[PDB]
Amino acid sequence: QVQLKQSGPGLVQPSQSLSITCTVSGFSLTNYGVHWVRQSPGKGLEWLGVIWSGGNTDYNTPFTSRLSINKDNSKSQVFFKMNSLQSNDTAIYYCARALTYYDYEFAYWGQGTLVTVSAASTKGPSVFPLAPSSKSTSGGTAALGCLVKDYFPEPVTVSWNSGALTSGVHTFPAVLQSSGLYSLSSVVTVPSSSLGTQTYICNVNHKPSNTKVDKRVEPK
Amino acid sequence: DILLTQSPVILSVSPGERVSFSCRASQSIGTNIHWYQQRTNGSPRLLIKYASESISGIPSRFSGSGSGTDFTLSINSVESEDIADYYCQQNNNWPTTFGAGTKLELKRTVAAPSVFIFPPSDEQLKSGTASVVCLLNNFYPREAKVQWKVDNALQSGNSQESVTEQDSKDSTYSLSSTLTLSKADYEKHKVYACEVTHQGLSSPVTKSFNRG
């Protein structure tokens, strides 16, 4: 199977440089070019450039002087680097591959890397339980969750029972508090009859700060 | 650079209906246009290439047509998992450019929210902050009112709301309202009430608790 897997999301200080690694499998960088695209709130989807099978590069015009793309064929890695970032370079950066070696129809994309350009510091979240009670139980269905509070920057991933619990899960979009830190909740609805038998754990991972917390959520 | 204009900004349809997205180009680009789907938290997915040519693994309900400057992506019978944004891309002229996208929303029958309230955890209280969470689960449509009251006093400006994107399986929304106060303020009051108003309720629903 063809895959592009990118390095993790993170903070970059203004005026500083961005580095992303794209590791591919299921094809060889000697046969295919690898493209870079970003998606920002202001400018939407925006093609940045490409490194070709033979090592040649093209950069979209506004980035020619602050962009370098490199690779190591043997390691199946493509390296993206952009200089002197300002806050409006905050975006999701993707690496991508076309259907044919010479083309631009992007059939394979990396998972994207959220890059935030801010002067602030990275802070991991506190994780608190949202305990099921009778004030959260209707008709045999109980609601429960985790409050994921005071982190920066986006994103944070949340799963339940190590991925084994997916149905009934809602992970809310983060909101920015006045403190300049993000907060979200993640909830799930379950049978109330299972609260005595099953354990419920939110698996929280804030990659920019390397903060991993597993929070057990119990009725009070 | 070629400018691509997608219209309208938002489409709203019912399941089973046919729907069309428009992509118009600032000058002729032949049939050199590709279409993409973006679902919640996802990367773009390639739907159609060169205006009309099919892509492997893509449902037959997706087709596209057009040439010159006027292009159309169609879905002949919309399903719930088609909730997404849709983008066009031209590559007749360097550099390749994308349109700004069209959002596809799905209509469904009215569904009242299920409401739950969660007092702050003793864990959170230890840090000197109190978050009171009120959950509105699986409802349609998106419009809803949350009114917070502490000891019959209307709270204002001290809560934040977050609404999920439309659920790809049942087309509902979920909403979280979070009331945030200092531990000191929290400890000084007894009754915490979350009141919910929605088109699907024949009456406002209140969920509340007394501290301790």
Partner: peptide, 11 residues
């Protein structure tokens, strides 16, 4: 049309 970095969806 405003793209949201959190959800990867248009607003």
């Amino acid at each position: 049309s405003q793209f949201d970095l959190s959800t990867r969806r248009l607003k």
